[PDB]
PDB file of C-alpha atoms and ligand atoms in Angstrom:
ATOM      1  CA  UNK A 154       0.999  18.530  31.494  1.00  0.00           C
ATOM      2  CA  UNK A 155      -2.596  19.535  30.992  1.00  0.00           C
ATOM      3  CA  UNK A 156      -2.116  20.371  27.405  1.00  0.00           C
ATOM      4  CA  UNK A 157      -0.743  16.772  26.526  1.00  0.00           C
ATOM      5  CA  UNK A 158      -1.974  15.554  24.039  1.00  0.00           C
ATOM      6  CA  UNK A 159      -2.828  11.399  23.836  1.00  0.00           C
ATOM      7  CA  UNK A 160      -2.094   9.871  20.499  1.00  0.00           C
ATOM      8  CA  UNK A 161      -5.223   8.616  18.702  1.00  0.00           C
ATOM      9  CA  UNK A 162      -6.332   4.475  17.939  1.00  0.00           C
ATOM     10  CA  UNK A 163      -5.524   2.086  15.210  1.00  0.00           C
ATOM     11  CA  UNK A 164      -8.620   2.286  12.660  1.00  0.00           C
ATOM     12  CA  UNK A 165      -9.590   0.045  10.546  1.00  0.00           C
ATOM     13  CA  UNK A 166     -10.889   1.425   7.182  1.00  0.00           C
ATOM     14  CA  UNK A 167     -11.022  -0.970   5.221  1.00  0.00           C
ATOM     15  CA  UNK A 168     -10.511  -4.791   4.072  1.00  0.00           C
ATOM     16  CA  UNK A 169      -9.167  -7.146   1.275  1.00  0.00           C
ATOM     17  CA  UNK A 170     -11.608  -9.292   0.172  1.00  0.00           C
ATOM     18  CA  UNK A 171     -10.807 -12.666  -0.367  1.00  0.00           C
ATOM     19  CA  UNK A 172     -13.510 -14.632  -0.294  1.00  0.00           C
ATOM     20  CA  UNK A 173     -14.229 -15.251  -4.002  1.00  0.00           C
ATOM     21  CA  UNK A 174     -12.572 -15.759  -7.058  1.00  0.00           C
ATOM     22  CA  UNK A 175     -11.641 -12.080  -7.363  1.00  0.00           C
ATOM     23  CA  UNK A 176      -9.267 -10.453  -4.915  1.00  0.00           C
ATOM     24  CA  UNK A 177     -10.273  -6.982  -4.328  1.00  0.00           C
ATOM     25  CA  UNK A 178      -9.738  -3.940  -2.026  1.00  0.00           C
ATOM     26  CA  UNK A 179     -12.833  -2.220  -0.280  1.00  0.00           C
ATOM     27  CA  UNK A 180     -12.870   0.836   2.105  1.00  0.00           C
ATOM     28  CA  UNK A 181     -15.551   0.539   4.886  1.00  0.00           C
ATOM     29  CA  UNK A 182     -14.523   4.315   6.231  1.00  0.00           C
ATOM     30  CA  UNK A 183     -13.568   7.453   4.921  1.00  0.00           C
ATOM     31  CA  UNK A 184     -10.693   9.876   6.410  1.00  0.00           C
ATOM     32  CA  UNK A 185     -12.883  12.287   8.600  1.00  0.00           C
ATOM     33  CA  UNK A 186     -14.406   9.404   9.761  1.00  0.00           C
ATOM     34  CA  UNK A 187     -11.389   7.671   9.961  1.00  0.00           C
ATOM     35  CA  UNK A 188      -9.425  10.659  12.110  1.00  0.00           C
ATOM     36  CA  UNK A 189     -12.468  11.298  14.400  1.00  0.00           C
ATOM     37  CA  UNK A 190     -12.804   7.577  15.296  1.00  0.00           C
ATOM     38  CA  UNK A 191      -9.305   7.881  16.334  1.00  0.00           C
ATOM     39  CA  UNK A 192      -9.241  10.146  18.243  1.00  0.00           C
ATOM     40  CA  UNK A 193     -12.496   8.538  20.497  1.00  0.00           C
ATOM     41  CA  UNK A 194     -11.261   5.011  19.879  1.00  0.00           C
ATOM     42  CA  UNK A 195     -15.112   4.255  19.111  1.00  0.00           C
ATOM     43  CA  UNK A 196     -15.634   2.388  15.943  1.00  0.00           C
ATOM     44  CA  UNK A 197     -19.395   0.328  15.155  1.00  0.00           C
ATOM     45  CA  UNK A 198     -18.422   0.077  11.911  1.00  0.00           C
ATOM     46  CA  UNK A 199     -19.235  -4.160  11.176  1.00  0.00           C
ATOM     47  CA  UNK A 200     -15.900  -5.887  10.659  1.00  0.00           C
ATOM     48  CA  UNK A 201     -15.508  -8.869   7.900  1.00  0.00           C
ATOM     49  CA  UNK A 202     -12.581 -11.111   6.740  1.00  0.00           C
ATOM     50  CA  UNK A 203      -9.006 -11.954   7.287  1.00  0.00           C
ATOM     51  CA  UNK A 204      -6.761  -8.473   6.196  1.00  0.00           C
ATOM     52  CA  UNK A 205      -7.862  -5.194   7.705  1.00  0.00           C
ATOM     53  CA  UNK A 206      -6.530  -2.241   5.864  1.00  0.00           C
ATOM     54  CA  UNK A 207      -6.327   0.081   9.056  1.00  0.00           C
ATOM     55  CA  UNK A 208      -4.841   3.464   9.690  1.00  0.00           C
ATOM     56  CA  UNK A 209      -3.675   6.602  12.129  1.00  0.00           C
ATOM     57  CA  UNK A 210      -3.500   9.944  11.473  1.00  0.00           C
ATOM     58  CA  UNK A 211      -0.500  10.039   9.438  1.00  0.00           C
ATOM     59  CA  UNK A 212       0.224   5.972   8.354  1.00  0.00           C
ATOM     60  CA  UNK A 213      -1.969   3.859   6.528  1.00  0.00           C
ATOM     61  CA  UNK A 214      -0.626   0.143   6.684  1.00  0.00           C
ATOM     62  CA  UNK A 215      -2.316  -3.721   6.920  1.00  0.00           C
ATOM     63  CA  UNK A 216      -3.697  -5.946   9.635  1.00  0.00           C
ATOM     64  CA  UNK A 217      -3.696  -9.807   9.304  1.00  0.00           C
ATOM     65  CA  UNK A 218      -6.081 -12.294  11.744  1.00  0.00           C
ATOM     66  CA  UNK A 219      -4.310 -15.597  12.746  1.00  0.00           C
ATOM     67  CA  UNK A 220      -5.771 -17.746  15.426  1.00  0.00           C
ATOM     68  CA  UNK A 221      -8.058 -15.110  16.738  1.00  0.00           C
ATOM     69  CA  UNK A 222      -5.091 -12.414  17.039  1.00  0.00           C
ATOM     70  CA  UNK A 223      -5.073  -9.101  14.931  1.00  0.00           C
ATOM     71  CA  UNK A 224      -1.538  -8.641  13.782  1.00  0.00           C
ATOM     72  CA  UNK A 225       0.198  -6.186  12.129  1.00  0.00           C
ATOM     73  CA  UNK A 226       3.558  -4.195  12.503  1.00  0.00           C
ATOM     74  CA  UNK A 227       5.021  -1.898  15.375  1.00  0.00           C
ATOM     75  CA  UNK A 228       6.834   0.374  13.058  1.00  0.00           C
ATOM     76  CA  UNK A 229       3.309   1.180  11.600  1.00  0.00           C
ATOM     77  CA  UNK A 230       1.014   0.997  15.143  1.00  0.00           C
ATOM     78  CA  UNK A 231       3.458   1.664  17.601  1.00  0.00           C
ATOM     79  CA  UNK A 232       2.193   0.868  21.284  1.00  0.00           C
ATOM     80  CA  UNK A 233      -1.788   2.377  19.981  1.00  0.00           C
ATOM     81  CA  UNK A 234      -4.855   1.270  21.157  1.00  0.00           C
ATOM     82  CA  UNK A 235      -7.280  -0.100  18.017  1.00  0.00           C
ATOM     83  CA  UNK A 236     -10.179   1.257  17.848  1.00  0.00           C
ATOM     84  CA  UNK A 237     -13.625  -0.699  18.577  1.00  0.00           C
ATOM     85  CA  UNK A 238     -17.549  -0.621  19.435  1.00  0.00           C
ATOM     86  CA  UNK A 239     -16.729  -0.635  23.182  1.00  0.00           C
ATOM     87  CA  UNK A 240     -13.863   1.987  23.154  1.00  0.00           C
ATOM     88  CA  UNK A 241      -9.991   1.549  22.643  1.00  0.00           C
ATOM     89  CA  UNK A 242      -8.581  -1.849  22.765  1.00  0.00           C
ATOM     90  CA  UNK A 243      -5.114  -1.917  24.634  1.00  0.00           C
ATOM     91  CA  UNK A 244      -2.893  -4.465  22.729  1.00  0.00           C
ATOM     92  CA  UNK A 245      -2.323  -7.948  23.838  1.00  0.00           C
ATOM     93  CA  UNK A 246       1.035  -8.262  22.104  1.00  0.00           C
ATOM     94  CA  UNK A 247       3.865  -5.815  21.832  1.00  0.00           C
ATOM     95  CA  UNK A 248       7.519  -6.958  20.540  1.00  0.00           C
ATOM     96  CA  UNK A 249       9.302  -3.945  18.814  1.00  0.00           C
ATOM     97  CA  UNK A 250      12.232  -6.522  18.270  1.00  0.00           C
ATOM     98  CA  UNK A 251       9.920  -8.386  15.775  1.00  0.00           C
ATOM     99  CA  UNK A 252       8.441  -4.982  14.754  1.00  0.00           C
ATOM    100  CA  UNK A 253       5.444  -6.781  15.451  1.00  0.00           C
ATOM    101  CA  UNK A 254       2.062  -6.202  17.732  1.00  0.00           C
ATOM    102  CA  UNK A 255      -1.095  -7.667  18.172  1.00  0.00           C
ATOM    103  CA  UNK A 256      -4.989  -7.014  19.220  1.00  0.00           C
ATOM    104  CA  UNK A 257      -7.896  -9.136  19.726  1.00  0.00           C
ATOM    105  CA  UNK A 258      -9.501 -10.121  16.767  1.00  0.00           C
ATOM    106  CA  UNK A 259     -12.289  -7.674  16.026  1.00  0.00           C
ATOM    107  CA  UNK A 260     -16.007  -9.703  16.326  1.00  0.00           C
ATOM    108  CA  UNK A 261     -16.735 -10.745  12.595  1.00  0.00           C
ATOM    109  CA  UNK A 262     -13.177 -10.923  11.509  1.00  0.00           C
ATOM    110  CA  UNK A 263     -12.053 -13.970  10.005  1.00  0.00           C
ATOM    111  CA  UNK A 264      -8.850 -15.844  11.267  1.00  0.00           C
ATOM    112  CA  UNK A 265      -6.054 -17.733   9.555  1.00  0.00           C
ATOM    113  CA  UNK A 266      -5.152 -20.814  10.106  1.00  0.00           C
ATOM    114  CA  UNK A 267      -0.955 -20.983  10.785  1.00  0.00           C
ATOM    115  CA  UNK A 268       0.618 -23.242   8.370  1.00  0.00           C
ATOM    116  CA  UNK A 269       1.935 -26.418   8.618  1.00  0.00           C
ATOM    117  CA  UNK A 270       2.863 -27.197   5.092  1.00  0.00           C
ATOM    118  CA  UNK A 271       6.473 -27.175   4.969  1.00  0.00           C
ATOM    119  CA  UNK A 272       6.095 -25.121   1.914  1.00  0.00           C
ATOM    120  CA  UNK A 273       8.259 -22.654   0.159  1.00  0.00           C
ATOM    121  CA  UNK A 274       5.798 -21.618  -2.867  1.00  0.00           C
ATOM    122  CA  UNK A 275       4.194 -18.589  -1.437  1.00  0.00           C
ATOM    123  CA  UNK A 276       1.849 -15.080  -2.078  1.00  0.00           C
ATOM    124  CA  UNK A 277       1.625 -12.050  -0.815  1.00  0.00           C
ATOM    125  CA  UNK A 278      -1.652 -10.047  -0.172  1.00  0.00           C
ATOM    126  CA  UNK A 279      -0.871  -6.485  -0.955  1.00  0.00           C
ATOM    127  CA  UNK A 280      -3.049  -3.327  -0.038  1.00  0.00           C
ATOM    128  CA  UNK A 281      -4.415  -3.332  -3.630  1.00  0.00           C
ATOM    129  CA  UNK A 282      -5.547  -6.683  -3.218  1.00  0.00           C
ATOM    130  CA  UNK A 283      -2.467  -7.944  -5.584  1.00  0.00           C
ATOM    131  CA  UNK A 284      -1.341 -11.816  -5.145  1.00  0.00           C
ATOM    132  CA  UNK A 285       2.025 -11.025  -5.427  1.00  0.00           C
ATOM    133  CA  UNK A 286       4.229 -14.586  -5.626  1.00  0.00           C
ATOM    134  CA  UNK A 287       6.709 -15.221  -3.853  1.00  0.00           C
ATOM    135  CA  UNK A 288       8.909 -18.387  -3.298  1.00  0.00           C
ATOM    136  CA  UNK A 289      10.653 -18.491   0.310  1.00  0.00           C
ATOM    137  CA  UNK A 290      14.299 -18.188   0.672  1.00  0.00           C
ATOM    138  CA  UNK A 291      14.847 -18.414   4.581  1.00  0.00           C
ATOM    139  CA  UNK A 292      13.442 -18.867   7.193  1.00  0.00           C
ATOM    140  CA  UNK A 293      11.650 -14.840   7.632  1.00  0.00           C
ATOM    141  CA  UNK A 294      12.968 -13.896   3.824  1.00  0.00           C
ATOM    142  CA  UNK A 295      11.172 -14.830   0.353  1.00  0.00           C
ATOM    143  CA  UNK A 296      11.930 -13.745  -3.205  1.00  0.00           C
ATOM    144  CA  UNK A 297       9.339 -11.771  -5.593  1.00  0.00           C
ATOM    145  CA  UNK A 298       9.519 -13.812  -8.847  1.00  0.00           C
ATOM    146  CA  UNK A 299       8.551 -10.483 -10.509  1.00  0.00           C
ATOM    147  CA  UNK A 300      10.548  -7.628  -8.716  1.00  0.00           C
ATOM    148  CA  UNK A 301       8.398  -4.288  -7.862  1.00  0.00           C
ATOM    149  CA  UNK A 302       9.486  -1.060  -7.010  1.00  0.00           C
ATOM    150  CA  UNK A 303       9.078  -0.175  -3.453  1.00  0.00           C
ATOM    151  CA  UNK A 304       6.523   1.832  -4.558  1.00  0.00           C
ATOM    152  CA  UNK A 305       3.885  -0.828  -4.965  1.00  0.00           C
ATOM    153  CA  UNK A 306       4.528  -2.428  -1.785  1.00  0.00           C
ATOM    154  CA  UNK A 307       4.200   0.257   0.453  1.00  0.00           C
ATOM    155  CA  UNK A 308       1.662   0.581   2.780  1.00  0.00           C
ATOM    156  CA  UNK A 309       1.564  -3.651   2.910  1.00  0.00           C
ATOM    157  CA  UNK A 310       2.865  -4.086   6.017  1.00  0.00           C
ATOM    158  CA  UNK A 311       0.978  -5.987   8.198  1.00  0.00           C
ATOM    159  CA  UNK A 312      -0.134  -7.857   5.375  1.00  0.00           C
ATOM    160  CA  UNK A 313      -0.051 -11.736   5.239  1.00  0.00           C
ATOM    161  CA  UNK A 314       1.763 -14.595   3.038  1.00  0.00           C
ATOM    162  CA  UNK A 315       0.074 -17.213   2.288  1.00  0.00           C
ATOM    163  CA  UNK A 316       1.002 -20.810   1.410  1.00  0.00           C
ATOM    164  CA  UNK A 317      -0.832 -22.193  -1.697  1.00  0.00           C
ATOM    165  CA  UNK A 318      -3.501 -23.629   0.599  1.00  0.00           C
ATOM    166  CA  UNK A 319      -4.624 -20.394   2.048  1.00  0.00           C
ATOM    167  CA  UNK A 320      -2.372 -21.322   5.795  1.00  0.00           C
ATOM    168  CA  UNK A 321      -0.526 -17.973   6.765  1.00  0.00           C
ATOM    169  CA  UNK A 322       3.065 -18.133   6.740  1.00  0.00           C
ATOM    170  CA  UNK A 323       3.846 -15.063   7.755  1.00  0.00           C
ATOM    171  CA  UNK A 324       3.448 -11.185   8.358  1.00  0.00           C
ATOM    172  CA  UNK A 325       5.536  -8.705   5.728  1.00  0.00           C
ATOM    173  CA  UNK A 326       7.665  -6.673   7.810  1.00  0.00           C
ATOM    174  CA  UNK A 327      10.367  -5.629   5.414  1.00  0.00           C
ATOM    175  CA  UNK A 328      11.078  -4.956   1.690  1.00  0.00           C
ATOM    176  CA  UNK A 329      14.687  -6.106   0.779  1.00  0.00           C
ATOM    177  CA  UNK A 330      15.603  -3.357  -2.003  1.00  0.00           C
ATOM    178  CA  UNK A 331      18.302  -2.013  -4.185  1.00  0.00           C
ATOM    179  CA  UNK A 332      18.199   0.852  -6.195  1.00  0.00           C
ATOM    180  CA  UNK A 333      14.172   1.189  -5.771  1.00  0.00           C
ATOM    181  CA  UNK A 334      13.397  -2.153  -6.488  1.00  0.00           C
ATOM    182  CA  UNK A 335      12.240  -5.082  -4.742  1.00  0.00           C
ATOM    183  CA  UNK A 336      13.765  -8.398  -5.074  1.00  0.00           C
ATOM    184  CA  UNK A 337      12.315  -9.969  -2.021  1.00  0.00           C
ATOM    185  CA  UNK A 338      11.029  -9.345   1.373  1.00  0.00           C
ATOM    186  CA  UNK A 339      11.144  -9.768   4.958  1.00  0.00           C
ATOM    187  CA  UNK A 340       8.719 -11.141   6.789  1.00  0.00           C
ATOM    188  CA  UNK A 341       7.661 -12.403  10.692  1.00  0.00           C
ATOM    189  CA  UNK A 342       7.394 -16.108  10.566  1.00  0.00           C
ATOM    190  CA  UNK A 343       3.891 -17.138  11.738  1.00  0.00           C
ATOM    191  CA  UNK A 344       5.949 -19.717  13.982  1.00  0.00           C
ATOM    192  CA  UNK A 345       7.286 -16.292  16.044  1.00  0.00           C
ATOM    193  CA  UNK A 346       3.366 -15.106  16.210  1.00  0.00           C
ATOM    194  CA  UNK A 347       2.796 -19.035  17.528  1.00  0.00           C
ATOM    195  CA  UNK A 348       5.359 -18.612  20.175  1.00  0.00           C
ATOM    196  CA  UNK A 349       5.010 -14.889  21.257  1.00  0.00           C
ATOM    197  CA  UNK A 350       1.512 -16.229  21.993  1.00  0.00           C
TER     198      UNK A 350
HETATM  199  C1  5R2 B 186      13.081  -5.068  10.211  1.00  0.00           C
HETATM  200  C2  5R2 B 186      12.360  -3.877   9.775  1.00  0.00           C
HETATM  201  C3  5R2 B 186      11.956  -2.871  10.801  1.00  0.00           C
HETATM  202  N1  5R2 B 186      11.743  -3.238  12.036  1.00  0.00           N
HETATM  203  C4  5R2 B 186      11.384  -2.312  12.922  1.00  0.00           C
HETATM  204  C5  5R2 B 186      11.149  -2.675  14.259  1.00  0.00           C
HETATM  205  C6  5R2 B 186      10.752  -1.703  15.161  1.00  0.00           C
HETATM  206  C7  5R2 B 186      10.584  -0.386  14.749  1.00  0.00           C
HETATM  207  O1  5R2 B 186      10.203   0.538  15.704  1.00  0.00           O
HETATM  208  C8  5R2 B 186       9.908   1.834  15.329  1.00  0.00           C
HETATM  209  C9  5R2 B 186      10.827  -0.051  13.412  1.00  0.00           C
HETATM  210  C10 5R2 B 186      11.214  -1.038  12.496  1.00  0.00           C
HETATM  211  N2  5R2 B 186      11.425  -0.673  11.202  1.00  0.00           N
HETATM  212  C11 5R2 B 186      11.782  -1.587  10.360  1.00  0.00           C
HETATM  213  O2  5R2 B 186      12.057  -1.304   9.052  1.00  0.00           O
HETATM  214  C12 5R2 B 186      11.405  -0.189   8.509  1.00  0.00           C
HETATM  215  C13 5R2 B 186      10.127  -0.354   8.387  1.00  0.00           C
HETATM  216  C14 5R2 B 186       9.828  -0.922   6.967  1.00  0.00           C
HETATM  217  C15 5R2 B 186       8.872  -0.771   5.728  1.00  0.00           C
HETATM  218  O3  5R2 B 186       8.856   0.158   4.986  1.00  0.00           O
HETATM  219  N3  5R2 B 186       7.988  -1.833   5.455  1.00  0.00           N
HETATM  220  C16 5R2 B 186       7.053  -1.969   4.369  1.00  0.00           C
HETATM  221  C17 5R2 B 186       5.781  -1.053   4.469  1.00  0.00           C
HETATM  222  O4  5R2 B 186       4.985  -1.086   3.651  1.00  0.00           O
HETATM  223  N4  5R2 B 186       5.540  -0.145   5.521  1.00  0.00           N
HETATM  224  S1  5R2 B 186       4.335   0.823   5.685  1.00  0.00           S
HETATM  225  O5  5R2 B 186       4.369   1.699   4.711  1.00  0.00           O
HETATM  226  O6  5R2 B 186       3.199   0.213   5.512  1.00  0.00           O
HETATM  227  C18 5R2 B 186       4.425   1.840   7.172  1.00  0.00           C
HETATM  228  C19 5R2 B 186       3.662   1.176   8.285  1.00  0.00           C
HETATM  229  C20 5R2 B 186       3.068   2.317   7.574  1.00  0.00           C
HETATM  230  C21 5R2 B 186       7.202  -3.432   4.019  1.00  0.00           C
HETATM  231  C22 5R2 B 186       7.109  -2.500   2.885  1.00  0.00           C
HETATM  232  C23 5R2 B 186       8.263  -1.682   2.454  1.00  0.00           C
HETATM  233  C24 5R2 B 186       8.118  -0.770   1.437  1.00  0.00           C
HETATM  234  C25 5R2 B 186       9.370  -0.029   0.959  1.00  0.00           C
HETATM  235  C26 5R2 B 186       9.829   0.921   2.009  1.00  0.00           C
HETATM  236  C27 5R2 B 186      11.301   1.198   1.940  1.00  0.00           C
HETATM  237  C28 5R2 B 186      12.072   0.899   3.202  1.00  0.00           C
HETATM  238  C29 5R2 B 186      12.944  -0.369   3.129  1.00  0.00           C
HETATM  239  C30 5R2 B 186      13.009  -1.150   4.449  1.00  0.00           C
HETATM  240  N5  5R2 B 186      13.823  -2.244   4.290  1.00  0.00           N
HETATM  241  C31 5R2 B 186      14.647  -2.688   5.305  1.00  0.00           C
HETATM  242  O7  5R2 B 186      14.463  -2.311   6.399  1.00  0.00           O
HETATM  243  O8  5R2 B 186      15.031  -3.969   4.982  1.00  0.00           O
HETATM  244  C32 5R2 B 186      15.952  -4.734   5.713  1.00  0.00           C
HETATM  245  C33 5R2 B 186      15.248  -5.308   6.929  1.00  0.00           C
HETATM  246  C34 5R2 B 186      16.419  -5.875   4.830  1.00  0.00           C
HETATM  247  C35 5R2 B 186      17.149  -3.921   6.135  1.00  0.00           C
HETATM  248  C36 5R2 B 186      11.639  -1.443   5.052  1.00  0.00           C
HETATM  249  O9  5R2 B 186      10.926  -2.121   4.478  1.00  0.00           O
HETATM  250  N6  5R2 B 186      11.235  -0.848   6.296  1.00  0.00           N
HETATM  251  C37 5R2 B 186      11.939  -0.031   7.021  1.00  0.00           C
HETATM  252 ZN1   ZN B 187      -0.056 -24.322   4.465  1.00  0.00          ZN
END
């Protein structure tokens, strides 16, 4: 019992930027900072925008801001603490039926505004800042209109779709995939977010 070991924070590490005309990936944190801020849960790093790239010790995934929530997958975050300026953050939302959990937003993040559209022509935000179309099939599915290999999706989760008006839709969860390649994905309606709230 004394020589249990606790698992480390959620870090963030990172952003997508999308405030300008050019989408772009930045890192705010390198991996020894990155694996000691885990472990303490202590982060001061200054926190900007709507999609975190965050990270443990062994995953590196997303994190998507909607309606002062920070969102991302269960699959990638498990029940973890994130890591902040004041210490760990216990989450606020945990549904491993939705593979989805949620913090606080971070102070300085940027939220998204759920959509209310009624719109099926949609885009993905990938970790390396691709906007990835995608028009929406279902109610949590949508189709790439380029396929990918799984390869350049992974490590999106937690990552947002967007309607063409910048709303979020929803949270990509899943890659739907045969043979390697993507045809479309699966995704946490931002009306489940809405209503786990
Ligand atoms: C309902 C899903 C779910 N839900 C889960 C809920 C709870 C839970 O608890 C542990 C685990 C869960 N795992 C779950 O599924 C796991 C997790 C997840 C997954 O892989 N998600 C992605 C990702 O990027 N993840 S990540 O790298 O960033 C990881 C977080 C660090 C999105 C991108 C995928 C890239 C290609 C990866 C090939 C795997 C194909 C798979 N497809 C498949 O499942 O598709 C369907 C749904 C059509 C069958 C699939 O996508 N996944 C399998
Ligand atoms: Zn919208």
């Amino acid at each position: 019992m004394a020589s249990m070991k606790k698992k480390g924070s959620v870090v963030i590490v990172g952003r997508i930027n999308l405030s300008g005309d050019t989408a772009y990936a930045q890192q705010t944190r390198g991996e020894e900072g990155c694996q000691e801020t885990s472990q303490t849960g202590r982060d001061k790093n200054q926190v900007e925008g709507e999609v975190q790239i965050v990270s443990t010790a062994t995953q590196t995934f997303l994190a998507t801001s909607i309606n002062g929530v920070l969102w991302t997958v269960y699959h990638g975050a498990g029940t973890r603490t994130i890591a902040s300026p004041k210490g760990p953050v216990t989450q606020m939302y945990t549904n491993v039926d939705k593979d989805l959990v949620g913090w606080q937003a971070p102070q300085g993040s940027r939220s998204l505004t759920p959509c209310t559209c009624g719109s099926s022509d949609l885009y993905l935000v990938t970790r390396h800042a691709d906007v990835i179309p995608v028009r929406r099939r279902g109610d949590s599915r949508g189709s790439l209109l380029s396929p990918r290999p799984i390869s350049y999706l992974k490590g999106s989760s937690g990552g947002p779709l967007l309607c063409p008006a910048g709303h979020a839709v929803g949270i990509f969860r899943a890659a739907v995939s045969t043979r390697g390649v993507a045809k479309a994905v699966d995704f946490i309606p931002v009306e489940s977010l809405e209503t786990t709230m």
